[PDB]
């Protein structure tokens, strides 16, 4: 039975790398298929710099942190957030990356997160 929060950590990987650039062709399905592979461990989480988005494919999956006051374990408490064509879906906070699906890419480091199964 599903608790609200789960600890995970997230494979980094580098935009260059990343076969399957989305999850999905709708705000609704994309973030369907995000919390899916979170529960089968095969997302990962691209850090957002310059350049980054427009090699990836919306709608967007974003993990947002969802509050500023404590991070639990080192395990930043974040919430998942959805774009497309410039609009929001959900308001949250500081964007810790862009989730991909993840089909055995090799990362660069891990990202711990408490993320709210919403
Ligand atoms: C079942 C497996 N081949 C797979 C990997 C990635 C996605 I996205 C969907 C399905």
Known sequence: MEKTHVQLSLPVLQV???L???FGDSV???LSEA???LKDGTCGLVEVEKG???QLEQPYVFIKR???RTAPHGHVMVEL?????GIQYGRSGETLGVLV????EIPVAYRKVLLRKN
């Open 35 to 37: 919390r899916q592979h």
């Open 28 to 30: 609704e399905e994309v």
């Open 66 to 68: 969802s509050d500023a």
């Open 81 to 85: 957030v959805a774009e497309l064509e």
């Open 16 to 18: 260059r790398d990343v």
């Open 52 to 54: 980054v988005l427009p």
């Open 101 to 104: 699906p993840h089909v055995g």
């Open 20 to 22: 399957v650039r989305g």
